[PDB]
Amino acid sequence: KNEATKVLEHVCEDINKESYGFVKISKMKENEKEIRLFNLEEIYHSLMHLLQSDIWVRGRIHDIRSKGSLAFIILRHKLYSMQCILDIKHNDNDKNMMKWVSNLPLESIVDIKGKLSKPEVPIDSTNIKYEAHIRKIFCISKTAKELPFLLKDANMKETNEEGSIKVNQDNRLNNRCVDLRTYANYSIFCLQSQICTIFKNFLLENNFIEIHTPKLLGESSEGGANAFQINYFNQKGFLAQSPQLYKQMCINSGFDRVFEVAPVFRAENSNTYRHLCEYVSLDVEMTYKYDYLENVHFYDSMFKHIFTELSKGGKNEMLIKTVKGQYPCEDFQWLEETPIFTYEEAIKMLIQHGKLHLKEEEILAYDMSTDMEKELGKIVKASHHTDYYIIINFPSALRPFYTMYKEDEPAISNSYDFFMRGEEILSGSQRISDVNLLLENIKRFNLDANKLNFYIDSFAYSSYPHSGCGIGLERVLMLFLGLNNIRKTSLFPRDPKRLIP
Amino acid sequence: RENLKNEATKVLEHVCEDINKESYGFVKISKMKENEKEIRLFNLEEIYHSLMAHLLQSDIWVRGRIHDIRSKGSLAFIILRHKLYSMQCILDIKHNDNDKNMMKWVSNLPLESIVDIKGKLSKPEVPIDSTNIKYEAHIRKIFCISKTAKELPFLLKDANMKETNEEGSIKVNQDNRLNNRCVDLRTYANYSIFCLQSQICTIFKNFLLENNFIEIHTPKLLGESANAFQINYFNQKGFLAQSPQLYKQMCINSGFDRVFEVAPVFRAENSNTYRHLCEYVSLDVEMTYKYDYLENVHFYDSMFKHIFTELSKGGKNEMLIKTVKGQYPCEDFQWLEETPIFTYEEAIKMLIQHGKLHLKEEEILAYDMSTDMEKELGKIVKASHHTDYYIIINFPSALRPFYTMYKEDEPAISNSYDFFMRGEEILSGSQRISDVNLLLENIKRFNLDANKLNFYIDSFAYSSYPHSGCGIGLERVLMLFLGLNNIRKTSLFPRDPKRLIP
Ligand SMILES: Nc1ncnc2c1ncn2[C@@H]1O[C@H](COP(=O)(O)OC(=O)[C@@H](N)CC(=O)O)[C@@H](O)[C@H]1O
Ligand SMILES: Nc1ncnc2c1ncn2[C@@H]1O[C@H](COP(=O)(O)OC(=O)[C@@H](N)CC(=O)O)[C@@H](O)[C@H]1O
């Protein structure tokens, strides 16, 4: 009784003299710890002369099987799986070792000493088509709690059967540290990192500098009602909904081309599949020579570049494929030359396809809904065969006060949205860069010029012609992959009903 | 009788209607078409790079801000400015059809206005020492596309001057500069400072990516933490993150192995000092280690050494640093091929042996260094090791956060570290507790509420890799690299207990 459970909980005191057991990191000094420890990613990349001799590898026990003399371990690290096997082939039939190993809880972290070789038929699961024969296995971190759900279940595509295996969004978000271990979730957030990298490097290559502007404000920035309020040492303040005012102030200071990658905070009480209370905004602001279209074409080049880099062979292709295995969706498509529609044209397309009913004099007054966004996206996919397009010339009355209107037709503005799979990823405009026109537009929008005093003032000592845009990082990733919910592309999502974890 | 002024006023306000037939005036951008075609417009950075081409054979167009105008009778001298670059442009009316109205209009342009100039570049006998473009433009046309509307709060000539005690030296004080930040940021030194800030972010990110890190973004709206700003989050009590600590650890417990984040954090402590802000940009790293946390420590070290090396090489960074030093002189930042590392005990003994610190032996383990004492240790180490950069490890466990792993041999000491630049702290970090039972025990030891940290504690319950991390102040690193006297110089729009604006 005590006998067997003593070996099930066996702690190793000398890794040389023994071949299995729980071990503190302190004790891992076989021949004075000249251990060359490998991880699955390194192994994958070199094999797909590590394999001429025994090696040490660390990983999580993704799955365990045990029958008689044989025992299979699926060892996992990030995206990489490998089958390791304990058959007591060269272990002197310890048998107690078999009991110890076969009782290890899933997700436990293990250091295996073993020999690589390629099997006749590898497992279809392990993307490492080699296997390891276990000469020694030590557990440096034992799973302490039963998982909230099994990874095999959370990794599986949803069949939607009556008695089907399905892990709820709530369950996953509540237990995010486990949810993130699925192959698709790991890949999703590697791709999020990739988008940030391509974005920054493109702008840096085009002579931009990165800026960091405050999120604690004295005023609203993108509107008062939807801002979170704070007590700032007995001043009333707000969280930034956007770095809009500061990135323009930086252009007014001469920085010429700036970007920011930073959180913003939105306090709208909206609970939708695409709305967050906190998200990462990629912001750009820059000057133009004579026409604001110069900048629009530039923003377009940027996104085409992002798509080109995300769709390339190598790592990104494996990441996207791993996402698509659980969440299938056709490849994101874009044309060599991006289609650009005017808002009027887009609305007339919706009318022509009988999705909207509007007389002429009402078109510029209609404010396009998210449903109509997706309907326009379907129309353009069928006619232009792309998932990516631009709408310009939004009605002035539907855009913020800093948007420059067309002087010859003030009912429309020099403004633009970009769309992926029919849904908005980017919003931006030519800015009003004349301080008097700016004050006129502020009063036309019934805003309080005193609360905007420092921003306005930044235009009083001249102002370059400039434009800019703001982009949702989580939206871009969501829509590139076709995912159903933006909570899949934010690490720890924030929404009106979720502050935790 | 004297209505002639009315005419003069018409001249000073002249709006140009056709740039093909006129040589000066205010213009709409929509009217800058030369013979119905598009102007090839240059900026001063392009000119600087080319000349220091097609620029010397014919008239060109250049845009810039009027940094200065000097009127001298039939000549006027305009200094045009863009970024770090300036160029002298000359209007001589003998060459401009003896048109006195044009001269009158040019002289009356306010500083900082934005103009497009059409003219011919040539190299003068001896160039103006203030302009780093050593060519001059001789003006054939000049059009103003944005006129300064308001008297400046202070003059840029004064805001650019190095501070001295010489007679009639005008200083622009901090309160004034910060209040009119969009003007202050136009000084050459301030422009250069924030280019160097961007440079630090780029080098940090690129180093970590080349070493197989991924960038993460973790929430700043939190549910639970008294140095935190509070928020009402839809009838919940929320707080602003002081640090992404818990989430970057949670990511390591999720398998991400190597993560960094560049993001704001928010600190509500009521402290007004030269080096403390209420909002700043934190550079955070968190990563696993094989068997010894010192692996990661040496990695963080090479990261900073790499940053220093990249900041100190090449034309661009060299000119940015030289431009800062022209206004704010300071010895070049110094470091060693082997970074010195001291234990906390060692550092304390050094301070005591040098007469800078007196303590009872009993109080040696509880002592917490002041910032003045930080600078004193910095002076000692500068004199003995000839470096501005060094590391302290092995702080007492009682002085470090609850997630800090202590030495199991001697639990009073922890596996923690700070890095120092010019004697002042830039980085804080440690080996983490990665055993969930030890974590619960330490949380109990610090009289913390486990319920408030549940989601975090739970993330250690399904195994935890051995790991460590660090947090870095971006503005502090830049300030101490340049030797600047105040962190408000290295934060674009500073936040402190008495400054919410701009
Ligand atoms: N609640 C939200 N949750 C998640 N993502 C969101 C959310 N709201 C917006 N986005 C993303 O940010 C982009 C720009 O935001 P806007 O509010 O349209 O514009 C702005 O904030 C202007 N300052 C832009 C500019 O003119 O520079 C959107 O296209 C979308 O991808
Ligand atoms: N008020 C401030 N204003 C400007 N910069 C500041 C301010 N406070 C700190 N810093 C910078 O951040 C680094 C680490 O922050 P700490 O609070 O020491 O540690 C932390 O935040 C831990 N979570 C780090 C970790 O262990 O990961 C400092 O060295 C300094 O450069």
**Residue-by-residue DSSP string for B393-458:** E--BGGGS-TTBPBPSS-TTBBSEEEEEETTEEEEEEEEBP--HHHHHHHHHHTT--TTTTHHHHH
Query: Are A365 and A481 contained in the same domain?
Result: yes
Query: Which atom, in ligand 1's list, is nearest to the CA of A402?
Result: 26
Whether the Cβ atoms of residue B91 and residue B136 lie closer than 8 Å to each other:
no
Flag whether A272 is in a domain.
yes
Burial of B460 (0-12, 13-18, 19+ CB in 10 A): buried
| CB proximity list for A214: less than 8 A, separation 6 or greater | A240, A246, B264, B279, B492, B493, B495
Helix (H) or strand (E) holding A196: helix A183-205
Tokens of A260: 């920011």
Chain B environment of A25 (Cβ under 8 Å): 291, 466
Query: Are A468 and A329 contained in the same domain?
Result: yes
Query: Are A125 and A188 contained in the same domain?
Result: no
Phi and psi at residue A86, to the nearest 5°: -115, 105
Tell me A395's DSSP state: B
Whether the Cβ atoms of residue A253 and residue A463 lie closer than 8 Å to each other:
no
- Residue ID of nearest Cα to ligand 2 atom 10: B473
CA A160 to chain centre: 26
Chain A environment of B221 (Cβ under 8 Å): 228, 265, 277-278, 494, 499
Instruction: Specify the CATH number for the domain of residue B456.
Output: 3.30.930.10
Query: Which atom, in ligand 2's list, is nearest to the CA of B248?
Result: 27
Task: Give the residue on A whose Cα is nearest the Cα of B494.
Answer: A214
Tell me A499's DSSP state: -
Burial of A453 (0-12, 13-18, 19+ CB in 10 A): middle
Task: Give the residue on B whose Cα is nearest the Cα of A237.
Answer: B500
Query: Are B28 and B90 contained in the same domain?
Result: yes
Q: How far apart (Å, rounded) are the C-alpha atoms in residues A428 and A240?
A: 17
Flag whether B177 is in a domain.
no
Flag whether B180 is in a domain.
no
Query: Are B248 and B321 contained in the same domain?
Result: yes
Paired sense of beta strands A55-67 and B467-473, if any: unpaired
Q: Which residues pair with A82 in a beta bridge?
A: A75
Q: Name the nearest CA neighbour of A90 among A118, A114, A55.
A: A114
For residues A255-271, one letter each, b for 16 or more C-beta atoms within 10 angstroms of the residue's C-beta and e for the rest, the string is bbbbbbbbbbbbbeeee
Q: Name the nearest CA neighbour of B132 among B189, B83, B85, B186.
A: B85
Q: How far apart (Å, rounded) are the C-alpha atoms in residues B345 and A10?
A: 38
Q: How far apart (Å, rounded) are the C-alpha atoms in residues A45 and A24?
A: 29
Query: Are A330 and A470 contained in the same domain?
Result: yes
Q: Write the CA distances from B64 to A48, A207, A252, B25, B88, integer angstroms.
A: 55, 17, 13, 15, 11
Structural domain range at position B400: 188-489
Q: Which residues pair with A71 in a beta bridge?
A: A66, A86
Length of chain B: 502
The rounded Å distance from CA A245 to ligand 1 centre is: 14
CA B120 to chain centre: 37
Chain A environment of B208 (Cβ under 8 Å): none
Please say whether the dihedral angle defined by the alpha carbons of residues B374, B375, B378 and B383, taken in this order, is positive or negative: negative
Ligand 1 lined by A279 (C-beta under 6 Å): yes
Q: How far apart (Å, rounded) are the C-alpha atoms in residues A76 and A174?
A: 23
Q: How far apart (Å, rounded) are the C-alpha atoms in residues B348 and A337?
A: 66
| CB proximity list for B193: less than 8 A, separation 6 or greater | B324, B478, B482, B484, B489, B490
Q: How far apart (Å, rounded) are the C-alpha atoms in residues A135 and A142?
A: 20
Flag whether A480 is in a domain.
yes
CA B85 to chain centre: 19
Q: How far apart (Å, rounded) are the C-alpha atoms in residues A222 and A242?
A: 6
Contact at CB, A229 and B232, closer than 8 angstroms? yes
| Gaps in chain A after residue (C–N beyond 2.5 Å) | 48
Query: Are A320 and A435 contained in the same domain?
Result: yes
The partner residue sitting opposite B83, judged by closest CB among A141, A256, A436, is: A256
For residues A145-172, one letter each, b for 16 or more C-beta atoms within 10 angstroms of the residue's C-beta and e for the rest, the string is eebbbebeebbbeeeeeeeeeebeeeeb
Query: Are A438 and A308 contained in the same domain?
Result: yes
DSSP for A312-381 reads SSSHHHHHHHHHHHHS--PPP---SS--EEEHHHHHHHHHHTTS----GGGGGG----HHHHHHHHHHHH
Q: How far apart (Å, rounded) are the C-alpha atoms in residues A26 and B415?
A: 13
Angle at B470 between CA B469 and CA B476, to 5 degrees: 170
**3 state DSSP class of B101:** helix
Tokens of B345: 């005990």
Tokens of A65: 């099987």
Domain end (from B94, B128, B146): B146
Tokens of B31: 């009217």
Q: Name the nearest CA neighbour of A310 among A451, A151, A188.
A: A188
Resolution (A): 2.1
Instruction: Specify the CATH number for the domain of residue A63.
Output: 2.40.50.140
Query: Are B231 and B107 contained in the same domain?
Result: no
Please say whether the dihedral angle defined by the alpha carbons of residues B115, B121, B123 and B125, taken in this order, is positive or negative: negative
Amino acid at A176: R
**Active-site residue B95, yes or no?**
no
Contact at CB, A278 and B218, closer than 8 angstroms? no
Q: In this complex, is the C-beta atom of B467 within 8 Å of any C-beta atom belonging to chain A? A: no
Flag whether A214 is in a domain.
no
Residue of A462, A474, A475 to mutate for B, most B C-beta atoms under 10 A: A462
Tokens of B410: 């001697």
Domain end (from A115, A141, A167): A141
Q: Which residues pair with A470 in a beta bridge?
A: A283, A427
**3 state DSSP class of A118:** coil
Task: Give the residue on A whose Cα is nearest the Cα of B214.
Answer: A193
The rounded Å distance from CA A90 to ligand 1 centre is: 62
Tell me B112's DSSP state: T
Amino acid at B345: E
Whether the Cβ atoms of residue B264 and residue B303 lie closer than 8 Å to each other:
no
Judged by phi (left if over 0) then psi (alpha if -120 to 50, else beta), residue A430 lies in: beta
Q: How far apart (Å, rounded) are the C-alpha atoms in residues B219 and B244?
A: 8
Paired sense of beta strands B416-421 and A423-430, if any: unpaired
Phi and psi at residue A296, to the nearest 5°: -60, -50
- Helices and strands counted in chain B (H then E): 15, 18
Q: Name the nearest CA neighbour of B378 among B362, B392, B393.
A: B392
Burial of B370 (0-12, 13-18, 19+ CB in 10 A): exposed
Tokens of B267: 């600190």
The rounded Å distance from CA B277 to ligand 2 centre is: 10
Residue appearing with tokens 């913020």: A400
Tell me A397's DSSP state: G
Flag whether B151 is in a domain.
no
Q: How far apart (Å, rounded) are the C-alpha atoms in residues A251 and A208?
A: 11
Q: How many CA atoms lie within 13 A of B62 on its CB side?
A: 33
Q: How far apart (Å, rounded) are the C-alpha atoms in residues A67 and A98?
A: 10
Contact at CB, B150 and A253, closer than 8 angstroms? no
**Which method was it determined by?**
X-ray
**3 state DSSP class of B317:** helix
- Residue ID of nearest Cα to ligand 1 atom 5: A472
Q: In this complex, is the C-beta atom of B497 within 8 Å of any C-beta atom belonging to chain A? A: yes
Length of chain A: 501
Amino acid at A106: L
Query: Are B274 and B352 contained in the same domain?
Result: yes
Tokens of A28: 């891992």
Flag whether A434 is in a domain.
yes
Please say whether the dihedral angle defined by the alpha carbons of residues B340, B346, B348 and B349, taken in this order, is positive or negative: negative
Beta strand segments in B267-301, E = 279-288
Query: Are A205 and A333 contained in the same domain?
Result: yes
Flag whether A149 is in a domain.
no
Domain end (from B119, B146, B173): B146
State how many domains chain B has.
2
Query: Are B381 and B475 contained in the same domain?
Result: yes
Contact at CB, B501 and A454, closer than 8 angstroms? yes
**Active-site residue B275, yes or no?**
yes
Whether the Cβ atoms of residue A456 and residue A401 lie closer than 8 Å to each other:
no
Q: How far apart (Å, rounded) are the C-alpha atoms in residues A198 and A480?
A: 14
